[PDB]
């Protein structure tokens with residue numbers, strides 16, 4: 684009787700959506716934990732709330748790729764207090780790495796406390812608009828995840844990609860249309876942001892919206908193909 688099944692995405696499971704807890708016995712944001720013991724074996728999973736995590740919403744909504752997988756090196760822009768980062772940390776595991784970039788010092792304290800238990804998280808308490816200031820800390824990454832909310836933030840993501848993202852690496856970008864231009868339609872916003880990505884050789888491969896978890900919110904996944 685398999686109680687928790689591997690999901691199509693490596694490192695993700697269905698029980699609904701859960702990740703394997705990198706720190707058994709501890710929750711990050713009050714989420715339920717499910718520990719399964721058989722003999723001397725024991726594995727714990729943490730529930731992943733699509734109402735607080737746009738990545739979980741996107742997975743439940745059927746995104747084809749997330750590019751966050753065991754061993755991956757991830758640059759996470761807008762890490763906040765670490766809710767989604769904690770699950771990314773679970774997925775990439777001890778051989779992966781998550782750079783958790785966050786501008787707020789208050790949020791940063793939560794990220795620092797989270798990363799005390801998780802070796803694979805590096806809090807970077809800096810303004811992502813100016814990646815030259817922390818470039819010496821960031822090893823080249825496989826995937827960038829970003830929470831974009833202003834009409835200048837796709838460009839911020841791109842500037843980080845140009846500095847940190849490997850050729851042929853990937854990006855996963857959440858777009859809150861209301862925050863980019865509340866006077867535009869969600870479709871005008873999403874089309875405009877996709878255009879900004881393409882201008883920076885960030886080539887979308889898929890996109891989806893996040894109902895019923897969020898209103899007028901899209902996740903765009905794609906591939907970075909800079910010129911020589």
Ligand SMILES: Cc1cn2cc(C(F)(F)F)cc2c(=O)[nH]1
Nearest residue numbers: 760761785786811829830836839
């Ligand atoms: C909550 C939050 C979101 N965010 C998004 C960006 C980027 F501009 F890189 F997209 C940076 C941040 C950040 O420091 N905090």
